[PDB]
Design a protein around this nucleic acid. Sequence first.
RNA 1: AUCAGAAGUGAGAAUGCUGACAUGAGUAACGAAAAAUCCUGUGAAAAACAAGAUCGCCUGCCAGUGGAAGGCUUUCUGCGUUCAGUCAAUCUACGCAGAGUGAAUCGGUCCCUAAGGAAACCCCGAAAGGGCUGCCGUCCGAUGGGUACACGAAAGUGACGA
RNA 2: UAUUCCUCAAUGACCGAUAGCGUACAAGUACCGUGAGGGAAAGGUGAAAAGAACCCUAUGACGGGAGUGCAAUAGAGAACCU
RNA 3: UUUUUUUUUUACUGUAAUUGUGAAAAGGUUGGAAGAUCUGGCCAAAGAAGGUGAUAGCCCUGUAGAUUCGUUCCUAUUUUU
RNA 4: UCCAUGGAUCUCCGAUCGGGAAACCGUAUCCAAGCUCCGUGGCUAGUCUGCGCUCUUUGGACUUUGAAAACUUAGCGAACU
Lengths: 136, 130, 158, 44, 71, 110
Amino acid sequence: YQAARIGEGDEMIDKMKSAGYGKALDKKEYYGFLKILCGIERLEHAMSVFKNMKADGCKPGIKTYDLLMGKMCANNQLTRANGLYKEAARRGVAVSPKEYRVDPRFLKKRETLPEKTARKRRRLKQINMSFVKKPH
Amino acid sequence: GSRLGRRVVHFANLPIKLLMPTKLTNIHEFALRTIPSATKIEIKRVLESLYGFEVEKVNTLNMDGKKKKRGGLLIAKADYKKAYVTLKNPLSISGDLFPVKFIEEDRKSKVKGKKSHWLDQKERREVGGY
Amino acid sequence: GWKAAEKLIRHWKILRGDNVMIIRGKDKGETGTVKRVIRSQNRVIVEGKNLIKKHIKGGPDHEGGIFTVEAPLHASNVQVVDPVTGRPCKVGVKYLEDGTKVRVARGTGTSGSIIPRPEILKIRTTPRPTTAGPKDTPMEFVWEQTYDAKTGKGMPDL
Amino acid sequence: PKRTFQPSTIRRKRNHGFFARKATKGGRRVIARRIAKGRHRVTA
Amino acid sequence: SFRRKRASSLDILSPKRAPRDFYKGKNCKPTGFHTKKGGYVVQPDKLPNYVIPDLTGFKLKPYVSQCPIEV
Amino acid sequence: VKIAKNPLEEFFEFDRSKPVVYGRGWKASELRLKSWDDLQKLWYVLLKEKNMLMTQRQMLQAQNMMFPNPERIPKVRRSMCRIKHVLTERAIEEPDPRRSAEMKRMVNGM
RNA sequence: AUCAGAAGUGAGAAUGCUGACAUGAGUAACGAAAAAUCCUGUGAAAAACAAGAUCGCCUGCCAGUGGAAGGCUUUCUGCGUUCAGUCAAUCUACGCAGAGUGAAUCGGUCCCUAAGGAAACCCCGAAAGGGCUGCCGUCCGAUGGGUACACGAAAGUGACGA
RNA sequence: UAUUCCUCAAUGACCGAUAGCGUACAAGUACCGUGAGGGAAAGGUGAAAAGAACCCUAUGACGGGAGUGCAAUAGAGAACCU
RNA sequence: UUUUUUUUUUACUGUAAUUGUGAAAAGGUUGGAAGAUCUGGCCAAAGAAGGUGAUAGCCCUGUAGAUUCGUUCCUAUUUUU
RNA sequence: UCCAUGGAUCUCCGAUCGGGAAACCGUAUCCAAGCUCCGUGGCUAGUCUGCGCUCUUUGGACUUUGAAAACUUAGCGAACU
Ligand SMILES: [K+]
Ligand SMILES: [K+]
Ligand SMILES: [K+]
Ligand SMILES: [K+]
Ligand SMILES: [K+]
Ligand SMILES: [K+]
Ligand SMILES: [K+]
Ligand SMILES: [K+]
Ligand SMILES: [Mg+2]
Ligand SMILES: [Mg+2]
Ligand SMILES: [Mg+2]
Ligand SMILES: [Mg+2]
Ligand SMILES: [Mg+2]
Ligand SMILES: [Mg+2]
Ligand SMILES: [Mg+2]
Ligand SMILES: [Mg+2]
Ligand SMILES: [Mg+2]
Ligand SMILES: [Mg+2]
Ligand SMILES: [Mg+2]
Ligand SMILES: [Mg+2]
Ligand SMILES: [Mg+2]
Ligand SMILES: [Mg+2]
Ligand SMILES: [Mg+2]
Ligand SMILES: [Mg+2]
Ligand SMILES: [Mg+2]
Ligand SMILES: [Mg+2]
Ligand SMILES: [Mg+2]
Ligand SMILES: [Mg+2]
Ligand SMILES: [Mg+2]
Ligand SMILES: [Mg+2]
Ligand SMILES: [Mg+2]
Ligand SMILES: [Mg+2]
Ligand SMILES: [Mg+2]
Ligand SMILES: [Mg+2]
Ligand SMILES: [Mg+2]
Ligand SMILES: [Mg+2]
Ligand SMILES: [Mg+2]
Ligand SMILES: [Mg+2]
Ligand SMILES: [Mg+2]
Ligand SMILES: [Mg+2]
Ligand SMILES: [Mg+2]
Ligand SMILES: [Mg+2]
Ligand SMILES: [Mg+2]
Ligand SMILES: [Mg+2]
Ligand SMILES: [Mg+2]
Ligand SMILES: [Mg+2]
Ligand SMILES: [Mg+2]
Ligand SMILES: [Mg+2]
């Protein structure tokens, strides 16, 4: 997941499930995976891992929703963060209004004399190349 | 990332042009040509990382490119760097490789114009330079 | 002594493989096929026509003797044969139903028929090799996709 | 006999070199006149 | 390859054609620092490291085959 | 012979025999299918081929002999240029700023 | 053509200008009181080239060794004789082509300063600029002082003529 | 209203290789001078290279034939029209 | 949010389409070669110009235009604090 | 091949980060913020927190204007004749 090999990471997760070590995939390891995936800007696969975590029986507390809401607000997507707020309210998690700062990357926003000289240089070459070449 | 070092090169582009040695066996040193901005450590680490040479020492020298002048018209070749690489163990070059036979025949064309004792060494190192 | 201030012909209405008639010079009134076009001289070579005699001194590699070969003709000295009437004709530009440039016969006394692009043009002069060399990658290895941006397959070692 | 030109590279660079010309207003005028004529050798 | 230059470029000073205390250099990257006794200490942090993978077992070759393939 | 017996013989064309043929250069669309590891391995394969070719040209011209098939050198050169262009394309499309800067540094480092 | 018009409109001379070619003339000269001789070979051609033998000249300022200053490939090897060499040269500091210069210690770079130069601050001046290098002061500059960290100093010094 | 380091288009009872810019040609070059600076010369085979295979005599073809070409004293290698 | 699209009409040194398109016949003679000459058709909003084996409106590249393309306007860039 | 548009790469002096015999030498600037990885320290030991660098992003701190013929406006201002 640090090398952004998300499909191979998911396959390794399933392979760990097949080997009988699925009980060691607790909420701490899944939160570490989410922190790694949000830290390298893979928010969609982070949501996929979050959905798999919810389907695995692991119960996300306030830290997982804090991380995901902060990453969604940093990417200037307040609607999805509010949607996760409503989902965490439905699940029964102690959640609060909070100011998450938006990243300053996703926030919305005559020919000169040397150029004339270069154009004339190009035209002078073009004139010389328009004639029949003398064989030699 | 940058935790590994300050100057980490993943795509090296150092040109190495081997000069043909005089002998085909017991090669303790050989010479190559490269660009003048190459250093001894760059040549050594490229030659041991990319080719697996057992490099003992690298000596370098700068040469001006060949020039021809006819009073206003001057044509020239690039300056280059010549590197002498001494090996920890001797190597050899196969006779049938192209173009070793042609090079040896041309070189011999341009040069046309028992009493051993006890404990006498037979294949000793022959290294030039300082 | 190439003394004229002659400009290059930029868009040629005279192509390799065309059937033409020489309309000027020593071989005036003779037909042939365009073997080769020399664009840098505004000249063409018609197969078997405009013959010269070269006194070539035989070295260690080639052979000596007096050889007969074609000399180039100026591109304004040949004219495309009308495919219906068989006479030399000028060439016009007609746009087809799809919108493709074709050559048509032009001039009073011409049929206006389409002058077809020669079939020899689609053939490679340097044919493709039959057997791959020892450093040539086979095409099945070239097409093996080891990178995928969606699933992150083939990422670097960051 | 001993002649007027006794070469010394460092004296040539200190009297007629590029930065020797750049150090004075007259030398900068020499460089400007020199480029305006189109000489290949701007400084000696 | 031979390439044309100006004859005036032969007047640019080179240490091969200079007094013995003229130093120019060839834009080589430094590997350390000068000492004040005239020596030099090479610092390994400024040395290049070349990451080169193992090439044995690799299937891709310098050229791509030009044999006739398919329409 | 078939295989180079030492690192010195990798500067020689051991496969040269019957005129030997050489393919074309790699295209950018074909290199866009390859992983970073495969592209780095292909870069070093091309680098060793280029070193061998310049060695052969230098050896033959030192004995006043012609260097055969001189178009092999620009084929390798253009393939290497396309490899670096494809890797820089992948660096630009990286959404993470740190990873994009590290990929650019890996490509352009000397 | 003709009739008119516009002139950078007419050469034998300006010790006129540029180019070409004569005369003197096959003349002077072939450049330091060390010096040549022969066998063989090469070649179309050999007093002048290769190799050898004999003879001579230089030995503390023309003549040997290593090198600074300057030069900048003249070095070496193969091919060659159009140019050059005071030659009819096969030879060459000449033409073509290829090759050759390897450093912890040599010489530099680097540290340190002299004479000197320049910035900063300050002073002066129609402009441009000129001065000032310090009472607290910076950066260059060997022809001299230095050779296995960094920082500091009310310690010694480095440190010197004939 | 002034000027042209510049661009585009056009004109000439302007010049035509000792003329016209110093430079029609790789010129601010070669060359000269310590330096500031001074400062050249040199255009044209033929329509097309078809640029003369081969023979003879010289060490050596640029010669004499042959052949190419309308024409070869139109046969040159920064130069061959007259 | 995005895509398809109703979209008027003319003007431009726009020295735009590097180098798009762009008209117009055949014989005889001489000559190395035809553009010359004799017979005899045709184009011109094109007889500016440069080539082609001599002096070519119709052999070639162009040239006048005509078409395309892109600036204007009709088609207000408005609304909220 | 070529064209149009948009991209990737893009050595050095002039020259401006410091030095300088132009085309060379030396150069991780400095300081606030928030983030993946990295390493070490400490608790009553679990989605525990607190200290750091390197490099990445957004800012703000020092300072880098800069050339160019003639025309214009000014300052000073000859001599030959
Ligand atoms: K006179
Ligand atoms: K000596
Ligand atoms: K002149
Ligand atoms: K003639
Ligand atoms: K037009
Ligand atoms: K014609
Ligand atoms: K005409
Ligand atoms: K007076
Ligand atoms: Mg050395
Ligand atoms: Mg012509
Ligand atoms: Mg001079
Ligand atoms: Mg250049
Ligand atoms: Mg030297
Ligand atoms: Mg540098
Ligand atoms: Mg690069
Ligand atoms: Mg007069
Ligand atoms: Mg007169
Ligand atoms: Mg007189
Ligand atoms: Mg007399
Ligand atoms: Mg007498
Ligand atoms: Mg006499
Ligand atoms: Mg004799
Ligand atoms: Mg001798
Ligand atoms: Mg003396
Ligand atoms: Mg020489
Ligand atoms: Mg010699
Ligand atoms: Mg020689
Ligand atoms: Mg002779
Ligand atoms: Mg001579
Ligand atoms: Mg020589
Ligand atoms: Mg030393
Ligand atoms: Mg002082
Ligand atoms: Mg002073
Ligand atoms: Mg001052
Ligand atoms: Mg200074
Ligand atoms: Mg100092
Ligand atoms: Mg000294
Ligand atoms: Mg002393
Ligand atoms: Mg003349
Ligand atoms: Mg004349
Ligand atoms: Mg003139
Ligand atoms: Mg001849
Ligand atoms: Mg004529
Ligand atoms: Mg056009
Ligand atoms: Mg037309
Ligand atoms: Mg005309
Ligand atoms: Mg004529
Ligand atoms: Mg600087």
